[PDB]
Specification:
With about 140 residues, the chain is mainly alpha-helical. It is built from 6 helices and no strands. Bound molecules: protoporphyrin IX containing FE. This is Neuroglobin.
C-alpha cells in the first residue's frame, strides 16, 4: 500500500537514476565501501589476497532488482518469492542483515547526489518505505 503521489515521486526520481545506472551504482557502492569496507573482498579482485561476482555486473543486477521494485512500488507481493530467495543467496556468502541499513544509507546518498533539491522530504520518506519493504521481503531469507 503506497499511494499514487509517493509512487510517482519514486517513479520520477528512478527515471533520473535510470538515465545512467552504472554511474549511479558506483556512487552507491563507493559510499557503501566507505561505511563497510569489509564487503570489498566478496567481489572479484576486491581482496588484498587472491565464483565471486564482478563489481559492475553486480551493479547492473542491483539496479535491475530496484527497477522491479519500482515497477511494483504500489504492491511488492508478486516479488516476495524472488526477494526471499535473493536474501538467502546474500546470507549464504556472508552478507549480514545488519548491512541492510548500510545499503539503505548508500541508496539515499546516491539519490541525493542524483536529484539535489528534487530529493524532497517526501521523496526520501517514500524511498525509505520502498527499501524497508524490499529488506523485509529479503529478511525472510536472512
Ligand atoms: C552489501 C551489499 C551486497 C553485497 C556485498 C552483495 C554481494 C553479492 C554476492 C557475493 C553475490 C553472489 C552470491 C552467490 O553467488 O550466491 C551477489 C549476487 C547478487 N546480488 Fe548482491 N550484494 C549486495 C547487495 C545487493 C542488493 C541490495 C541487491 C538488490 C537489491 C543485489 C542483487 C544481487 C543479485 C541479483 C545477485 C545475483 C543472485 C544470484 O546469483 O542468483 N545485491 N551479491
Amino acid at each position: 500500500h503506497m499511494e499514487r503521489p509517493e509512487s510517482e515521486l519514486i517513479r520520477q526520481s528512478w527515471r533520473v537514476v535510470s538515465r545512467s545506472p552504472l554511474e549511479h551504482g558506483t556512487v552507491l557502492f563507493a559510499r557503501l565501501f566507505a561505511l563497510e569496507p569489509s564487503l570489498l573482498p566478496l567481489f572479484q579482485g576486491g581482496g588484498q589476497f587472491s565464483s565471486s561476482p564482478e563489481f559492475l555486473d553486480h551493479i547492473r543486477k542491483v539496479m535491475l532488482v530496484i527497477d522491479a521494485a519500482v515497477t511494483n512500488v504500489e504492491d511488492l507481493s508478486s516479488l516476495e518469492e524472488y526477494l526471499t530467495s535473493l536474501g538467502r543467496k546474500h546470507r549464504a556468502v556472508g552478507v549480514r542483515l545488519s548491512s541492510a541499513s548500510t545499503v539503505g544509507e548508500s541508496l539515499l546518498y546516491m539519490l541525493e547526489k542524483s536529484l539535489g533539491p528534487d530529493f524532497t522530504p517526501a521523496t526520501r520518506t517514500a524511498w525509505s518505505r520502498l527499501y524497508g519493504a524490499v529488506v523485509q521481503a529479503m529478511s525472510r531469507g536472512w
